[PDB]
Symmetry: D2
Subunit: 359 residues, 4 copies
């Protein structure tokens, strides 16, 4: 009878709410957020800026991340087997190439059709290791719309509201009008927004890792490619070039990984950079008719098929995501934030842990 | 060189920004807001919920409100003579009727074509006083779109951003990324949202006055009607029924005046109440074919032409709007908020005062 | 059951089809047409070019036209009383002014709220007679869409097909594939296209009267105005200026009456003419903010609210419409064409006569 | 100064008009047609019903058809090299399978990347010959829109008009109003409509070959497949199953070849037939997630991605297309009609001959 709040309507909050409602049928759940999946794109809302591909960054020794990523893959892949592309999922061969390293992450061996490839067969030079396996991409707008429909069907009440502090959920008459009584519990799925909701030491742990992408219309591309330069360093370190094709024919090209960079608007030079690198790792990203042209001329061909530029801020945190049980303003609090560049590939895993902590 | 911030992209912020940029051509102006005019309607954003009509509530002794309301009428009426309905304005005869009173507000005598009518000619019973005069309605979405285009043309930079505190404008890296240097000044045009930005005693002076409206498609209606019940009490007291026709053929029917009511969703019984009262004061709101039908059948005819239901929170303030110079967080601050049910009819007057205070 | 063909999907064909299906006479109805109401506007398809208003041209001594026009008025007015504007109908006050004449048609006295006005109160000069009465306008696209839905609901089969001759309905495999069996009957509701379907010496009787109109967005205008110059001459003679407001806020301004003029495209000078004459007869057609300006500036204000120019060819015929039973190409034939500038205002009346002729 | 008429705005008329205006810049050209490319689909207008692919039917000894087909290929391929998919063209690998034949048409060897394949590798049974080569598909609505824009830019006047007889062009006031003076010449590109415009011996040569197609949304398919059953017989004989993918992700599945069948509406049993046969010759037409399912479940999966059913009448003629100079009703007449199922793959070839015959 006392309301349970899910604060956040990104992929993290919506998956949390789905698992919450499935575990406790008819529970009194209110989802509050100041940005919703179908809103216009905004650099501050990470979930619809994402590619998204399932391409784990889980260190061999990071048992929690490996578990989350593979659990999430299992859920998404079973869903694709059931409904195909209806919710924005597309199974595909993912190819990862390393420019330095002579190993892949052990976590990839859990995916179907894992193969070690000859690094000399990469289209770009200096590739020292190369693997492929079956994975999935997600058109986030489509998938999030499906999650929104699902939480409605499960009986969640949805509210557009800004929450200035966790205490406000108990005290602010504007918020109390939504759910009548002070909440018994809150799931804090506020992404990078959690910086304004937690005490100073925890707030300090959050930082943006800015990512710019270029979305092209390239429906000929139905395979995934990533080039990793530099060590992950047990986290999400180094830089990536990637080709992330969606089932709708939009293909996300990236990326950048700028720690502490709060600039929300795309940079012209980075557009050029992304297009140039995308052509290096995946020559077939070019419009078919332009593929025989000098490499320099193919950038303009890619420009001609650009759908949009986009920028987002990965909600980065030292040690990865905070999924933990605490207390604030007399409410039971479950934190589920700080997923960096891996929220889409870990969402269902985190959601299940979060609900288990609450329960 | 130092940025000047306009916080808010409602009618108050946008008129403030226009007058600011007109007074000081090429100034470094950045407009920050978490809700913009063309966004989907939300009860928290009053400017696009409003009717809006110019129907002053200024008490005979309220010299400041009278001056603002008359100034705003002059600006809007001048604009209508220059551009017609291009920006959402429509000149019309406004008829006001009182159920109890035997006097009107002196301020109305400043409008063109002021006439005292025979109250016995009102279509509803118990009317003791009635006047008409030339006034204007505004389709707020259209007018705000023109204001947005105008501030762009004048060189303002526009940002979608939430401001958690005034200090954050100078200290918060997420906001500093927008304009680089710490701002010298901020115009706080945050509407009811100002309650999160000011000290608790100022925040306590602000309260919502909830208003529900029904929008109908009634392009045959090109005249305005209001019935006042109870005393204004030197502010915006009592209750009103109104018919507010827009140039686009949508006609806003209302209303309610629920002080402290934070419920953002429409109430079914209130829909019935509004349609019933609308028919009382203006029989011609009914579709022409339905005008000879019994009263109950005519409510049904109005239901058949409903476009939308909407709810908004008027940013009411004890003593009316705060338009004042101050200092806070190392900035020169001009507050311009708390216009209640009168922001549209006072906007330009208030904007000119705000810019003068800053200058 | 042998097919019964309605040839034409203008207002005449569709009303004929509705009345045919409503007759419940076991008719296996196939509606064939090379232009359908929701198709792009084309000067050759009169029904969606029309204003349309109900403003009878029926001469005092033209009993058939008077009966048709008043019957159609009753049907449309009752429809408006039942459903309001849902099917594109709008009741309004129609004001007619004459430049020269000292009387009105008797037929108008049958409308609600009839009155003879003081012609000195007309906004333009040289007005010698003026009346008003309650009438209706029709947004033809909306009303025709409603008729199309209605014939579908009643079980008619609808086909996009060009009929090269009446005989072809029985003999042409391209047409026979639509309905399998040779048709027993055809209602020829082909409008000006009937010139290619009726025996050739009857075709000389049909001619275009070209009409250009300017459609403006003027939702403040919900009253109708017409000025008649010259005599009707027992038919549709002389020239008219008119303001015909639709329920959707589009207002049709006109008009021209160019006999034998087959030019399907709007003329620049005619746009200027129509706007100028519209302002003469109805000063409030101008945008409210423009009403105090010089006449030339008001013409410019009208140009600023133009939605579209359009041209149509009225299916004119000496003697008015042919509504008649015949036998041709082995089939029972009912002709229902040649309604000139009055198809909308006579449609239901004609449809009922046509169906009665077939039913025998 | 005397008008030149192009009668018809299908692919044949519009290519003729383009070549006409390019040869004689500023010429007084009027294009008359009762159906235009952007009109709603109609079984009587073949050009937008077509797949279309470039898959020649030209007999080894049919010099004219081979010349036409290869010239048209050259023109379209050059266009695709210049603009890619901008005008609806997509280069692809076309694979043809024969159920009986042990040879391919010689004309195919003129296409790039020609190769004879192992017929054992066909996914369906009883294949005895198989080849592939580079060819093109066309999204006809997009291509015809480009042609329409081209003729406008070259100064053609376009008219929606029905021509009851060629004599009417000189004598009918309804047609004379379009171009003022009796025309000097007419290019008769009326497709199957030519049967109403030519003398009884020439009209008897024309007949419909009805084809029904199913359009699916299958953007994973960018390769073309055809199975030929029975002999071409020096013409377009026998029956074909085909997969014709467009650049916009629509894929046309077919077909039927019913001579003299004037039924313009799709048959339910033919939908089933086409879907079943498409799956036989190209298992990858099925949604990726459905590819391991039993055959009946895959047919159902194809039904779920259906965009539209369509029917058209190929303008078939004894001896193929009539491209011929004549004199009728006072005019210099060039006939260019009766292209059967090969109008798209022969259009530019025929157009050029037609303009030459007139010049
Ligand atoms: C360019 C780019 C590419 C990426 N690609 C991938 C990829 O391929 N695979 C992958 O797994 N991940 C990827 N990511 C990362 C992924 O997008 C994020 O980890 C994930 O979206 C974070 O989800 P979230 O729900 O925590 O945050 P968000 O999506 O930002 O949502 C937070 C929610 O909380 C609400 N909120 C916050 N504060 C408040 C408040 N005070 N009051 C009310 N509401 C509040 C917001 O309105 C919003 O609804 C990418 C990120 C970027 C930027
Ligand atoms: C039903 C109804 C009918 C009405 N009818 C009339 C009428 O007929 N005539 C009339 O004169 N008035 C009318 N009003 C009143 C009028 O709508 C308000 O007085 C006026 O819109 C207030 O404008 P504003 O710009 O102050 O507030 P708002 O429109 O609410 O805009 C405030 C802006 O501040 C931004 N903001 C606030 N806090 C923050 C933050 N922390 N960070 C970033 N951005 C922030 C918001 O995003 C928004 O852009 C009506 C009101 C209602 C509810
Ligand atoms: C500018 C203008 C204003 C007007 N204003 C008014 C007004 O205010 N009030 C009023 O009452 N009337 C008005 N009219 C007149 C009215 O529009 C016509 O009288 C009426 O539309 C004629 O209807 P119809 O069905 O006979 O002809 P059409 O609407 O032309 O329809 C004829 C049908 O026959 C079909 N057809 C013809 N030949 C063939 C063939 N060979 N094969 C297959 N199909 C064929 C066509 O495709 C079409 O479906 C106006 C006309 C014009 C031009
Ligand atoms: C199902 C199907 C699949 C096909 N697939 C292919 C393929 O893959 N490759 C290929 O090469 N071909 C294909 N075709 C064949 C191709 O569609 C035709 O050969 C080609 O479209 C014929 O073009 P057209 O311009 O002659 O005829 P149409 O496109 O029918 O155009 C005739 C034009 O003449 C006009 N017209 C006719 N009579 C008159 C008149 N009396 N007055 C005014 N205007 C008139 C019409 O309005 C129209 O504008 C296919 C056909 C079908 C039915
Ligand atoms: F906040
Ligand atoms: F014809």
């Amino acid at each position: 009878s006392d309301p349970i709040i899910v604060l956040g309507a990104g992929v993290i909050g919506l998956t949390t709410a789905v698992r919450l409602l499935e575990a406790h049928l008819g529970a009194n759940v209110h989802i509050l957020a100041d940005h919703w999946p179908s809103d216009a794109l905004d650099a501050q809302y990470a979930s619809t800026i994402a590619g998204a591909h399932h391409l784990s960054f889980a260190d061999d020794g990071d048992a929690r991340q490996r578990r989350w990523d593979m659990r999430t893959f299992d859920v998404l892949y079973d869903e694709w087997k059931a409904v195909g592309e209806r919710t924005g999922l597309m199974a595909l061969t993912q190819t990862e190439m390393w420019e330095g390293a002579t190993s892949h992450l052990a976590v990839y061996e859990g995916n179907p059709d894992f193969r070690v490839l000859d690094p000399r067969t990469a289209p770009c030079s200096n590739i020292t290791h190369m693997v492929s396996f079956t994975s999935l991409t997600i058109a986030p707008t489509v998938y999030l719309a499906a999650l929104e429909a699902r939480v409605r069907d499960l009986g969640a009440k949805l509210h557009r509201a800004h929450v200035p502090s966790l205490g406000a959920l108990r005290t602010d008459p504007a918020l109390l009008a939504l759910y009548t009584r002070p909440p018994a519990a809150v799931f804090v799925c506020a992404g990078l927004g959690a910086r304004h909701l937690v005490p100073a030491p925890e707030a300090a742990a959050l930082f943006p890792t800015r990512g710019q992408v270029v979305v092209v219309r390239a429906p000929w591309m139905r395979a995934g490619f990533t080039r990793q330069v530099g060590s992950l360093g047990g986290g999400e370190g180094g830089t990536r070039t990637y080709i992330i094709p969606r089932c709708n024919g939009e293909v996300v090209l990236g990326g950048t990984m700028e720690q502490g960079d709060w600039t929300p608007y795309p940079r012209d030079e980075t557009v050029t950079d992304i297009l140039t690198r995308a052509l290096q790792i995946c020559p077939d990203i070019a419009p078919p008719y332009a593929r025989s042209w000098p490499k320099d001329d193919q950038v303009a061909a890619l420009r001609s098929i650009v759908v949009r530029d986009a920028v987002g801020f990965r909600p980065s945190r030292a040690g990865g995501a905070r999924v933990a049980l605490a207390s604030a303003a007399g409410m039971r609090v479950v934190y589920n934030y700080g997923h960096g560049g891996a929220g889409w590939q870990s969402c269902w895993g985190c959601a299940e842990d979060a609900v288990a902590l609450w329960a």
